[PDB]
Design a protein around this motif. Sequence first.
Motif, PDB file in Angstrom:
ATOM      1  N   UNK A 171      37.661  59.205  26.207  1.00 40.03           N
ATOM      2  CA  UNK A 171      38.248  58.877  24.902  1.00 40.03           C
ATOM      3  C   UNK A 171      37.708  59.676  23.698  1.00 40.03           C
ATOM      4  N   UNK A 172      38.608  60.116  22.809  1.00 36.52           N
ATOM      5  CA  UNK A 172      38.284  60.861  21.583  1.00 36.52           C
ATOM      6  C   UNK A 172      39.026  60.266  20.361  1.00 36.52           C
ATOM      7  N   UNK A 173      38.402  59.236  19.783  1.00 40.03           N
ATOM      8  CA  UNK A 173      39.054  58.318  18.851  1.00 40.03           C
ATOM      9  C   UNK A 173      38.443  58.262  17.423  1.00 40.03           C
ATOM     10  N   UNK A 174      39.043  57.404  16.591  1.00 37.34           N
ATOM     11  CA  UNK A 174      38.980  57.145  15.132  1.00 37.34           C
ATOM     12  C   UNK A 174      37.618  57.238  14.451  1.00 37.34           C
ATOM     13  N   UNK A 175      36.795  56.205  14.487  1.00 36.74           N
ATOM     14  CA  UNK A 175      35.500  56.040  13.734  1.00 36.74           C
ATOM     15  C   UNK A 175      34.226  56.465  14.479  1.00 36.74           C
ATOM     16  N   UNK A 176      34.345  56.800  15.779  1.00 35.09           N
ATOM     17  CA  UNK A 176      33.221  57.268  16.621  1.00 35.09           C
ATOM     18  C   UNK A 176      33.651  57.872  17.951  1.00 35.09           C
ATOM     19  N   UNK A 177      33.870  59.193  17.982  1.00 34.05           N
ATOM     20  CA  UNK A 177      34.475  59.775  19.186  1.00 34.05           C
ATOM     21  C   UNK A 177      33.614  59.810  20.445  1.00 34.05           C
ATOM     22  N   UNK A 178      32.311  59.526  20.367  1.00 34.23           N
ATOM     23  CA  UNK A 178      31.409  59.271  21.515  1.00 34.23           C
ATOM     24  C   UNK A 178      31.158  57.772  21.807  1.00 34.23           C
ATOM     25  N   UNK A 179      32.165  56.923  21.561  1.00 34.28           N
ATOM     26  CA  UNK A 179      32.395  55.575  22.109  1.00 34.28           C
ATOM     27  C   UNK A 179      32.031  55.427  23.606  1.00 34.28           C
ATOM     28  N   UNK A 180      32.129  56.513  24.406  1.00 34.75           N
ATOM     29  CA  UNK A 180      31.726  56.691  25.832  1.00 34.75           C
ATOM     30  C   UNK A 180      31.866  55.446  26.732  1.00 34.75           C
ATOM     31  N   UNK A 260      27.017  51.296  22.121  1.00 41.01           N
ATOM     32  CA  UNK A 260      27.289  52.693  22.510  1.00 41.01           C
ATOM     33  C   UNK A 260      28.073  53.483  21.472  1.00 41.01           C
ATOM     34  N   UNK A 261      27.384  54.272  20.663  1.00 38.57           N
ATOM     35  CA  UNK A 261      27.969  54.974  19.514  1.00 38.57           C
ATOM     36  C   UNK A 261      27.440  56.392  19.388  1.00 38.57           C
ATOM     37  N   UNK A 262      26.212  56.649  19.835  1.00 36.28           N
ATOM     38  CA  UNK A 262      25.519  57.861  20.298  1.00 36.28           C
ATOM     39  C   UNK A 262      25.319  58.997  19.279  1.00 36.28           C
ATOM     40  N   UNK A 263      26.272  59.260  18.405  1.00 33.55           N
ATOM     41  CA  UNK A 263      26.146  60.318  17.384  1.00 33.55           C
ATOM     42  C   UNK A 263      26.583  59.899  15.968  1.00 33.55           C
ATOM     43  N   UNK A 264      27.788  59.295  15.846  1.00 36.77           N
ATOM     44  CA  UNK A 264      28.497  58.697  14.693  1.00 36.77           C
ATOM     45  C   UNK A 264      28.158  59.431  13.409  1.00 36.77           C
ATOM     46  N   UNK A 265      28.872  60.541  13.204  1.00 36.46           N
ATOM     47  CA  UNK A 265      28.694  61.554  12.140  1.00 36.46           C
ATOM     48  C   UNK A 265      28.985  61.035  10.737  1.00 36.46           C
ATOM     49  N   UNK A 266      29.543  59.816  10.626  1.00 37.20           N
ATOM     50  CA  UNK A 266      29.909  59.087   9.398  1.00 37.20           C
ATOM     51  C   UNK A 266      30.971  59.730   8.529  1.00 37.20           C
ATOM     52  N   UNK A 267      30.666  60.852   7.904  1.00 36.45           N
ATOM     53  CA  UNK A 267      31.516  61.331   6.793  1.00 36.45           C
ATOM     54  C   UNK A 267      31.340  62.839   6.585  1.00 36.45           C
TER      55      UNK A 267
END
Lengths: 267, 46
Positions: A171-180, A260-267
């Motif tokens: 998955x490559x999604x909305x608010x956190x693409x490493x949802x994994x 599981x959120x792993x990176x979450x680049x924010x903004x």
Amino acid sequence: VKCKPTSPGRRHVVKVVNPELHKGKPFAPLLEKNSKSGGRNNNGRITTRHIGGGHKQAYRIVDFKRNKDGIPAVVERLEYDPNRSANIALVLYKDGERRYILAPKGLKAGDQIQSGVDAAIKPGNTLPMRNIPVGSTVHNVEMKPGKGGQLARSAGTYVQIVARDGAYVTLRLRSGEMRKVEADCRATLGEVGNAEHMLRVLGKAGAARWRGVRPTVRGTAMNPVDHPHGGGEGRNFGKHPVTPWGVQTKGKKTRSNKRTDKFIVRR
Amino acid sequence: MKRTFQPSVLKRNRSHGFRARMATKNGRQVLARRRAKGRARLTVSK
RNA sequence: GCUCAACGGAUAAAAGGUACUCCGGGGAUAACAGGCUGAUACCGCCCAAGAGUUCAUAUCGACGGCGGUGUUUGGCACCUCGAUGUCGGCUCAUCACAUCCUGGGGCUGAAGUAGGUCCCAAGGGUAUGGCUGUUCGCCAUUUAAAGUGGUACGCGAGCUG
RNA sequence: CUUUAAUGUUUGAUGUUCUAACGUUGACCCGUAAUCCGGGUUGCGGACAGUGUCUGGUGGGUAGUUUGACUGGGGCGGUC
RNA sequence: AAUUCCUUGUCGGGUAAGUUCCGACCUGCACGAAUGGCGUAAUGAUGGCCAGGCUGUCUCCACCCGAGACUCAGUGAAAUUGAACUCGCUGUGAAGAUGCAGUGUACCCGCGGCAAGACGGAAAGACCCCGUGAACCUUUACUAUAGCUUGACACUGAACA
RNA sequence: GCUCGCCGGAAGACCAAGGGUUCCUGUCCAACGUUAAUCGGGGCAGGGUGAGUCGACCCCUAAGGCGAGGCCGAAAGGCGUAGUCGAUGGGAAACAGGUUAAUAUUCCUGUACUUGGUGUUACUGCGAAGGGGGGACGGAGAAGGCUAUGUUGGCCGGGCGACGGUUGUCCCGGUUUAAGCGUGUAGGCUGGUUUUCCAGGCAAAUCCGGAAAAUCAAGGCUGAGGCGUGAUGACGAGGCACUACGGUGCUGAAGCAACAAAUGCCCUGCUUCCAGGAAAAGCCUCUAAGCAUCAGGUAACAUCAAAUCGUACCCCAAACCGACACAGGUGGUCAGGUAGAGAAUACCAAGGCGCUUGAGAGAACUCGGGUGAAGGAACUAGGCAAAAUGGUGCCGUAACUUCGGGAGAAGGCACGCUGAUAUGUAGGUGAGGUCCCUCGCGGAUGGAGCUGAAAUCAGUCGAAGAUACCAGCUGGCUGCAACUGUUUAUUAAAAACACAGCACUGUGCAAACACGAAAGUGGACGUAUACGGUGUGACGCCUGCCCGGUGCCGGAAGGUUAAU
RNA sequence: AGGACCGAACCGACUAAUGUUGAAAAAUUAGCGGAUGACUUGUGGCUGGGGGUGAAAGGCCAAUCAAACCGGGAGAUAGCU
RNA sequence: GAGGGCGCUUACCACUUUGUGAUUCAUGACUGGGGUGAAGUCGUAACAAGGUAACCGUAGGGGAACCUGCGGUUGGAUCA
RNA sequence: GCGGAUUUAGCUCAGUUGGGAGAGCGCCAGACUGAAGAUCUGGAGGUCCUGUGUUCGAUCCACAGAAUUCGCACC
């Protein structure tokens, strides 16, 4: 609104140009399998969810789980849902049964509905992602692998299968693409059903936010018996945060299960 | 506004409910004072 | 041993416009006024320089001055903070006068014309539209008339704000 | 006998993890024509959670004080 | 605009008259980007004068069927208290004469005029403070308790690099 | 008697807040009707309100009580599954008369019904805790009927009707036709009927979902009432009477066709739109087990039981409340009437009943207003008060584009009342009479018996005809909340602003919030385009810039120097 | 079609006028709308103290509650005539 | 007995105006366009490489003197 | 009125143990320019407000005085 059928608002002849003008998606009776949503907040006792006005919820679509996979099916209709803006449709399965499914833009003909382990790649009920190709559109996603649909609606949230990522953790999604999350979750395909009901303002008001509820409308302005501000005379003028809890950036989470959120680049 | 005094039977239960006034210890003492020890009657029991 | 420097220190210390207003006593309490009488003001003028044209004594006024009806302002004071409630449009009309003419003398910087203020004294008018809170300040047409101190700065048992 | 090595002999601890802790508000199975609830397999993450003190400020989201007196009534400027 | 320091700030064009019926040379201390900005839809639970509407709206309401209240019959209670036989500027100040007397000498009643007169009622003045003081909201001043929030001992192990 | 009132969306109706028995009457004056007092639910002597069907029992359920075992609990207590309460959801289910002071789905007297026993004949294989049909909803509507109910008169009882007239062209009186049985019509729903099988339906299925062949089309399920059936069944013009003067005792008519319209019936028809209208059950069938030469249910007729109540006065509102028959409030119920856009208003027919202060007078006391000589707001905080103008339609109307809208803009104006066209036009209507057909709630031809504009060419009486009540001043501007407003009843009545987009923001999900001590109920039957911060100021452009200070936080190169 | 423009008892709260020495802690008269729903409309049962629902009020909420109408603390404090 | 004289009926139609627009003059009550450049004063990029050019639609900083990066068709020295 | 800054180079202004008078800038020279500025290297530019006293020495400080000037007092 640039798709077709787009259904535009009227000329300026009345106070309501919008809301939505779509013909061909309300029907009756409310058919045998249905239910509703109950009273007002009633949490027991001093209610924490503000402004209320809580009449007429009202009826909801009772189909979750949707695990009816390889029994093939066909399509009578599509409808609306005003709880989710959705393109939900009447799916007759060729064992001997009728359901209500979260379908994309124009999935009728009456089409070739069928899913499951290896058997199909077509328009398909709930479909394990480990069994099928790469693609942009996915929709359902069983939020953790046996629970149920993460998205109950086709409102444009494209959640996107990546290929060979991290042993099945796609998955490559909305608010956190490493949802994994594992490709052992189930898709449906796909996330654009009703763009129209959500790509434009329905109203200032329309029935969706006055015949059976109130939304938010105030918190800070008027009467200091609530928020940290602010004297009167129309002045306010101070340092007033959202106490004790904060606002325009800070974060709130430390620990929890899964997480599981792993990176979450924010903004 | 609709001021005030009127009679009814179904409003009684949570306030003027005669057996509810025996079920609470609040009520019980007052009843016994008002007609068991204190010489008297109530009788408005329909 | 100390900005415990509120040093006889009841405490280690946390701030306000009585523009919610009150508890038992309510001037033993400080709004303007009711006025004891007022130094600062009006009212009466002193003797005199002066500059009125080119003579002081009309006009007018140098530094100079003596004194009272209480409206300025103020020494403020009471029985008056369980009505002592404020404007100032009149209104009810009244006051006798710091002239306001209408006037009859006495006087002339009056020859008449016109200017000059001042005793004897308060009859009528106190009205105007486009203006603003207007006392004050006008603005066109103005007349037999076109003035003015407050008296608790004319008014809640008589006006809405 | 030490700057210090090799290894024995006392012995600890961050990472790196696997996983009879654990949480099961995820599923199969199951008592059960059953929303609580009984319980075993599985599937998950993970010594996480939890809160109890100590350190840190953060804001006027309960509660509190109305703290001299000098006052030609108070605000100032001056004093025992 | 609730900036318009001066001074009724302006040209005067229009007007029986510009303290504006607006008829575009500014004297802009402490003006405006979501406590924002160039502007506007038809609607008035229309805020503000200025027309021609009808006119009594002033000054001028001197004539009315008439409500009634005084008046004649039924019936006559209190918001609560200063005894009257209470002098129309009166004077004189424990600073207010309807009771310290200089005057004028007002027959007894309408509670019918009832105009200044229990300064009065409707009642702990609102202005208001001796107040060792009810708690009554806030603010980059005091904060405090609940809360926010990470890291640290508590508690839940070491095998290995 | 005789002349008129008030309530006119009646205090009309029966009966629901439990207040409770205080109506007819027979009798009266404190225990009170601030006149009388004879009346007020006054208040005293009788008695009364006759319910198998009315409705709440049930079988029952969406909210919400209580609840095993419990997870917990200081003693308190809280949150619950199975259960069980539970209507205001729903099922069975009263009328033509007559009958008493009353009181009346009751009383009777007839029709004949509902739940469930038993009886004798008949038909016949059933069952259930489970399955399936849907049992089931929201208003404005649309299209066509039935007349509720009215005005007519044929016809039937009176007869020609007191002043001036009236004796076949008038003028008055009922205008009723009970039921349950009987069939079916308006639009509606739905082509018929045997068989063969599943990727189906808590375990099953002659039932329901999907699928596979055979063989015919005219098949199936009612709906107001028209129409009838009953009925030599009644009701009643009117006669001879008795009387307790209330009334019943005898006797007794007349009895058809249309014309216009609902509020109401048909219509859980049929359309049109979404805020998206709650389950069991009656309705109707499937089978599990187990009975199975036994038992079960559906039918004809005979019967039985028909489970404590209440039913008196009383309401869009005086024994509730307000507490002075109170300018508070405020209903579910028959819908009384013509001309009215109408619950916009002065008149009505009843039922209660004109509601217990009016004799008289006629200063000034403003609870008011008018028509004013002059002028036209020469008034002031309120052209405040008194208005007036206020259709259908035109001889025709200005700035202005959000081309809706600003436009009943704006203006002043023929309007009374008959004739003629026309012994009524045109336009809605369709009696007969005559035909055709399928044979019956059938069609075609045809012009009866009623209704009734809109204008033409003529008439003229005025101070007056929208001769009367309902009911508007063009503007033109100052600030653009841009969404109607009824919004903080209580200063402003908005000159408050609740909109609603959105960049950023809270959470990768036992998601943010935690009211409650234990819930995991909101959000969720739900994903960071769901839901919450702090707001937003139609719409569309437009948000320059400027980081010194102070916010917002976020970090880690390295110093201030705490648990550890 | 529409929170139409103009419509009824089911809505309230604009300034007076006879509302203040009350018919009334509130309601008014010849006048007047929002014309279908940013309406209100009534049997009950969850919100029972320093409350709890937000058109967001210092108004409420018994009619005048910044916390009473409680009576138990308590015939408190009392620089008090 | 017929008109014309009139005495009726109503226009054509002059007044009038609900309206408000046309345009033609001066009273131009915050000032900006295209320039003579009586010595204006701050600049000063381009007509040779106007001595680390940039002409051509022009978006953009904002003393613009338009700086400043593309895409050329060489009126820009060469052997770059 | 009290307290305070201030009368220090054309221009903005620094400065003081209490003994020198400063700088960006401006002028001028030196040259680079025909010339001038920049940029340059050298020289120079003072009502230190006055008086008085302390004092080695006052621009300074304290005291007295002028004169600007700022806040508060004033209601």
